[PDB]
Design a protein around this ligand. Structure first.
Ligand SMILES: [K+]
Ligand SMILES: [K+]
Ligand SMILES: [K+]
Ligand SMILES: [K+]
Ligand SMILES: [K+]
Ligand SMILES: [K+]
Ligand SMILES: [Mg+2]
Ligand SMILES: [Mg+2]
Ligand SMILES: [Mg+2]
Ligand SMILES: [Mg+2]
Ligand SMILES: [Mg+2]
Ligand SMILES: [Mg+2]
Ligand SMILES: [Mg+2]
Ligand SMILES: [Mg+2]
Ligand SMILES: [Mg+2]
Ligand SMILES: [Mg+2]
Ligand SMILES: [Mg+2]
Ligand SMILES: [Mg+2]
Ligand SMILES: [Mg+2]
Ligand SMILES: [Mg+2]
Ligand SMILES: [Mg+2]
Ligand SMILES: [Mg+2]
Ligand SMILES: [Mg+2]
Ligand SMILES: [Mg+2]
Ligand SMILES: [Mg+2]
Lengths: 343, 184, 205, 132, 66
RNA sequence: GGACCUGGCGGUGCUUCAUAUCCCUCUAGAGGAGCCUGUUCUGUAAUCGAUAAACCCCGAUCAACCUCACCACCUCUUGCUCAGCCUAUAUACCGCCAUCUUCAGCAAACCCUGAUGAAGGCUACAAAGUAAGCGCAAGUACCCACGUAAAGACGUUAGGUCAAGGUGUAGCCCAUGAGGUGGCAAGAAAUGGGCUACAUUUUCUACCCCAGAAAACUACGAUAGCCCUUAUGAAACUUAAGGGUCGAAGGUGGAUUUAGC
């Protein structure tokens, strides 16, 4: 019956079944899902199976200065039109099948390490094109609710940085994963740290700190050493602009504790100029590649002390057994000093 | 502090229990657990203050001779009146005399509470006889008057392990003027 | 209600209005100037300013009314008052000059006194203490006492014990009995009080 | 919960027209009728026939002007005249709108045996009353 | 006294309920004082006259027959 | 395994409440009888759906044929349809709804606290929240500004409906489709709702409220049974109305329970 027919919107809303107890709690999963298709997309008003040529609707109204008359395509000429529409339909399907594949993260199914692009431009014509965003953790958090039972939300941790010392991180929370991505990355650029870098490639000194239960030990390294660090530290270091560093993470490997523990340690590093000013002495760098040449890296801006720094015959500094065990060669590990891709 | 918590952040805030504050208070505000404690403690002070006034001879020689005992004292949280339950004696006639003396004394008692300025802002004091013996007083009064007449296993997956393809769809594919009159 | 809360009940009392101004107090003067600004409900069809109006009989009539049949309920009431008066005129003419002085012939006086002799002072109401309901002998408010005297009188006359006796004869006979502190309804009052005395020990519940 | 002809609250991104935004209880209060004829007046006949004709014309115009209608049709009957008033978009060329007007008026005049006129009002975009 | 929805239009701002009460409590505190003429035109800006309909019954005209 | 959070639950505390409302109080009922009607069970060759609140005179503002989807028998095969299917799945859905709701909350976008932990965000003499939108509210309908309707979000019950229609998936295609004839729908029983009663505030007649009779085995009381007639229909022991005959249980109904300001 003609009167029992419905519109396409009604038919797709029913067929897709996006509203319902199945879609309320995700009670239904969709390895095979009905996908909405616009069936009026490639359709031309006036074109039908019979192949009639209606002047002014599907063919031009005037031809050679005269009004065209009703005509019908030949059986052969109409098959070509039908065949051409089928090919155009598979070509359109091929255009949708051709989607550019994006680079993966730390692993194929992991969100960690994936770039989210620059943060969105602020309301007052503010822009962050110089900043890159990286995901550090995407978690599904499940909240038990008084009336609705277990609900699913997303907690995301992302880090931002411009590669020139300015970097930050923020947590994002939302019911949708892409709304959380927006919140974290936009928020992160308003909580930026500035990180001091020695010669714009490494840290100024070895950093050993604990944040809660996560211990991070970082070592200053020369050029060409690369980033031999926990994968998250590698990601964060590329955003900061650190090229050469060793880091060892022990204790609880909690991504959030690691991130904020890392930023706390990198933000409290004393530069060579700060050391020179504090002690009113020259900071002299001795490099084995340059032999005995003394390279003054920093000099105090104020007066220069005349009394040498006391030379304690033996320093009362606390040592790391891992560092000492290595220096002596007693540290044997099949996993240390393994060949890895450039980082 | 003790197992009973006393770390209130607004600990120094000046407790102001007045009838006017209730009208400017936010009924939307939900009372804290320790907000009751401030009310409960004030009620204890009102009990001690009335109880002590009761046993001193000078305040009112009529009041002292009665040897009145207060069962309980609970100030209204509205602050309209200070309820002051007084234990009811078994003697039926004595419950009226005690009550009458209390009502007359109550008016002067409120002024005497201003003498202790800390308790100055006291609402009108109300005395309530304990119905345990008082309710029976009303009945027995009617009981004698009354005329009694001429006597004679589907597997349930873990929600945290539930697989999702949101990343696989993300990683698989990057998702996909001039106006003029009489145009020819 | 179709009356907004602003509507006040009408005061139907001729005397209340003819009272001179001088006798009025400063409080009564304020109430009178206030009502001139207030909305007044329409007077109900039941009550009028008539000098023969009796609110108690009008109430007893409504408690006898079945299914909104006021005409029948009113007819039964006036037939009862006529039956009471005729029974007293017959007792009056048959009596001696000495006994005649004690014989009441006004049915309104008999009706009121008959009910007042049936009003129960105290009643049994279940006050709860300890998880159980104990029929505590509780004082009765004035409204409840008057209502119970009417409900007991109407209930007794509707009892099936009366066989083919019309209501105006039953009710008249019960009113004159209760007027003399006699009858079943008077017994119900006495027994209710006696039960309330046997449960005096339960007044703590 | 009532469902009939109620566009349900969403995230604030769904544009609804004035007609779509008003539930049935607002009919005759805030919104008028989409068809006006005498069949539903007391003592008047042929309400069933006017109703079937109206259901057809709405389907006919939806499929005859595919993707062009920006709102529901307003159907007016005076005497034996049938006037169809439609709010359409400005995407189709004017030649195709004139073709379809001439075609639709003629075909409907012969189908229902009455003079039929079609009145087109063009809008640049669907008029949005609110974002539900 | 003007209602909150009328104060919210004189000020052209949104107000809380407690904001309204605080303003009224402060105006009442001003009337109890010995306010002069300058302090009386100000308070009347926030007093809205309440027009009361009279409950007095309307009397029908007295007509005359033939 | 430790600590903590949330939810659920507690024969868990305290406090204040429900306005036809949880208890008592007020009025008329149900629960007992007959009848009407629904369901269950049983029965039958002989639908389906609803089925605690939120099913049970419910889908039906309605089944003698038809309706009809059931059963038996017979028949047709590109079939009223560029077929058809009341076949499975309401736990794939649209559509339209129940329910808390006789609620007042839901909430995008931001901001802040907890070390940037799961989490949390209020104090008015105010101490971190601001909030579009939706609902309530307002407005409108009915006789007012009252009342009654209408309205009532998000969410709860994978609540109801694939048999209104439509439709995803799966299945049938000489049959799970189509047509014809006849037939089923009863009551050992149980139960829900309703009607009529048990009578004297009643029954009959006149009247529409100043009457006369009736009033316990010829009273009250069947709208039941049986018989006849009429109405509708092609078709009526069957449906309805009326008349005749008949004159039964019932004598105001335990625990329990419904509605009304
Ligand atoms: K709990
Ligand atoms: K009953
Ligand atoms: K549904
Ligand atoms: K269906
Ligand atoms: K289906
Ligand atoms: K019943
Ligand atoms: Mg892989
Ligand atoms: Mg409803
Ligand atoms: Mg029964
Ligand atoms: Mg059934
Ligand atoms: Mg079933
Ligand atoms: Mg079902
Ligand atoms: Mg149920
Ligand atoms: Mg048949
Ligand atoms: Mg049939
Ligand atoms: Mg079939
Ligand atoms: Mg369902
Ligand atoms: Mg209203
Ligand atoms: Mg309603
Ligand atoms: Mg409303
Ligand atoms: Mg279900
Ligand atoms: Mg078949
Ligand atoms: Mg009969
Ligand atoms: Mg016939
Ligand atoms: Mg008989």
């Amino acid at each position: 019956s003609f009167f029992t027919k419905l519109t396409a919107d009604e038919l797709w809303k029913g067929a897709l079944a996006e509203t319902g107890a199945g879609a309320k709690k995700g009670r239904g999963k969709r390895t095979k899902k009905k996908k909405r298709k616009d069936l009026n997309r490639g359709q031309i008003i006036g074109e039908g199976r019979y192949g009639f040529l209606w002047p002014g609707l599907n063919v031009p109204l005037m031809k050679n200065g005269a009004v065209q008359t009703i005509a019908q395509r030949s059986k052969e000429e109409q098959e070509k039109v039908e065949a051409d529409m089928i090919q155009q339909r598979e070509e359109w399907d091929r255009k949708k099948k051709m989607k550019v594949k994006r680079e993966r993260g730390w692993s194929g199914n992991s969100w960690g390490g994936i770039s989210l692009g620059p943060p969105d431009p602020g309301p007052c014509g503010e822009t962050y094109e110089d900043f890159d965003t990286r995901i550090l953790e995407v978690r599904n958090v499940f909240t038990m609710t008084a009336k609705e039972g277990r609900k699913k939300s997303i907690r995301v941790l992302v880090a931002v940085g411009n590669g020139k010392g300015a970097a930050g991180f923020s947590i994002g929370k939302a019911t949708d994963r892409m709304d959380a991505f927006r919140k974290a990355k936009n928020r992160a650029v308003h909580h930026l740290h500035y990180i001091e870098r020695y010669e714009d490639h490494t840290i100024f000194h070895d950093i050993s700190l604990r944040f809660k239960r996560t211990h991070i030990k970082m070592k200053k390294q020369p050029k060409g050493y690369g980033l031999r660090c926990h994968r998250a530290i590698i990601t964060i270091c590329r955003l900061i602009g650190i090229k050469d560093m060793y880091a060892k993470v022990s204790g609880s490997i909690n991504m959030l504790s690691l991130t904020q523990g890392l930023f706390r340690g990198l933000s409290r590093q004393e530069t060579h100029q700060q050391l020179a000013d504090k002690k009113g002495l020259h900071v002299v760098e001795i490099r084995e590649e340059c032999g005995p040449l003394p390279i003054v890296v920093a000099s105090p801006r104020g007066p220069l002390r005349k009394d040498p720094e006391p030379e304690d015959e033996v320093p009362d500094v606390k040592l790391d057994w891992e560092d000492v065990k290595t220096a002596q060669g007693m540290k044997r590990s099949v996993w240390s000093n393994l060949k890895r891709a450039a980082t | 502090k003790v197992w009973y918590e006393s770390p209130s952040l607004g600990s120094h805030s000046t407790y102001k229990p007045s009838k006017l504050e209730f009208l400017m208070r936010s009924t939307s505000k939900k009372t804290r657990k320790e907000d009751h404690a401030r009310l409960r403690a004030l009620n204890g002070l009102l009990y001690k203050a009335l109880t002590d006034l009761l046993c001193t001879p000078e305040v009112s020689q009529e009041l002292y001779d009665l040897n009145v005992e207060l069962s309980k004292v609970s100030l209204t949280p509205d602050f309209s009146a200070c309820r002051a339950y007084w234990k009811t004696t078994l003697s039926a006639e004595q419950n009226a005399h005690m009550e009458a003396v209390l009502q007359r004394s109550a008016a002067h008692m409120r002024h005497l509470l201003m003498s202790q300025q800390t308790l100055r802002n006291v609402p009108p004091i109300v005395f309530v006889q304990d119905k345990g013996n008082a309710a029976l007083a009303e009945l027995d009064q009617l009981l004698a008057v009354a005329d009694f007449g001429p006597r004679d296993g589907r597997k349930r997956a873990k929600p945290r392990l539930e697989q999702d393809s949101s990343l696989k769809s993300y990683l698989s594919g990057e998702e996909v003027e001039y106006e003029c009159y009489a145009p020819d | 209600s179709r009356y907004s809360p602003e509507f006040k009940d009408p005061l139907i009392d001729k005397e209340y209005y003819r009272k001179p101004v001088e006798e009025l107090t400063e409080e009564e003067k304020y109430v009178r100037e206030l009502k001139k600004t207030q909305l007044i409900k329409a007077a109900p069809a039941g009550k009028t300013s008539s000098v023969f109006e009796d609110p108690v009989i009008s109430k007893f009539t409504n408690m006898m009314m079945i299914g909104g049949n006021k005409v029948l309920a009113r007819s039964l009431m006036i037939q009862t008052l006529e039956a009471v008066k005729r029974k007293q005129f017959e007792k009056y003419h048959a009596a001696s000059a000495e006994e005649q002085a004690t014989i009441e012939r006004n049915p309104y006086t008999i009706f009121h006194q008959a009910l007042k002799n049936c009003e129960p002072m105290i009643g049994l109401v279940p006050i709860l203490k300890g998880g159980r309901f104990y029929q505590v002998p509780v004082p009765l408010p004035d409204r409840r006492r008057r209502f119970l005297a009417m409900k007991w009188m109407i209930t007794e006359c509707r009892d099936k014990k009366h066989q083919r006796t019309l209501m105006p004869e039953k009710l008249s006979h019960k009113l004159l009995e209760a007027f003399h502190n006699q009858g079943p309804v008077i017994k119900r009052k006495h027994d209710l009080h006696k039960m309330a005395e046997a449960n005096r020990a339960l007044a703590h519940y | 919960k009532n469902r009939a002809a109620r566009v349900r609250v969403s995230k604030g991104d769904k544009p609804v027209t004035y007609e779509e935004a008003h539930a049935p209880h607002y009919i005759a209060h805030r919104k008028g009728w989409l068809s006006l004829h005498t069949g539903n007046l007391d003592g008047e006949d042929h309400a069933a026939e006017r109703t079937v004709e109206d259901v057809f014309l709405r389907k006919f115009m939806w499929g005859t002007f595919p993707g062009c209608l920006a709102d529901q049709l307003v159907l007016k009957r005076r005497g034996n005249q049938l006037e169809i008033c439609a709010v359409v978009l400005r995407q189709l060329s004017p030649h195709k709108y004139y073709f379809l007007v001439g075609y639709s008026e003629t075909l409907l005049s012969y189908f229902y045996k009455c003079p039929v006129r079609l009145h087109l009002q063009t809008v640049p975009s669907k008029v949005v009353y609110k974002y539900l | 006294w003007l209602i909150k929805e009328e104060l919210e239009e004189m000020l052209v701002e949104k107000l809380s309920d407690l904001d309204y009460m605080q303003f009224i409590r402060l105006l009442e505190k001003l009337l109890t004082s010995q306010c002069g003429a300058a302090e009386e035109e100000f308070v009347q800006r926030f007093r809205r006259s309440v027009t009361l309909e009279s409950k007095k019954q309307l009397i029908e005209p007295v007509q005359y027959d033939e």
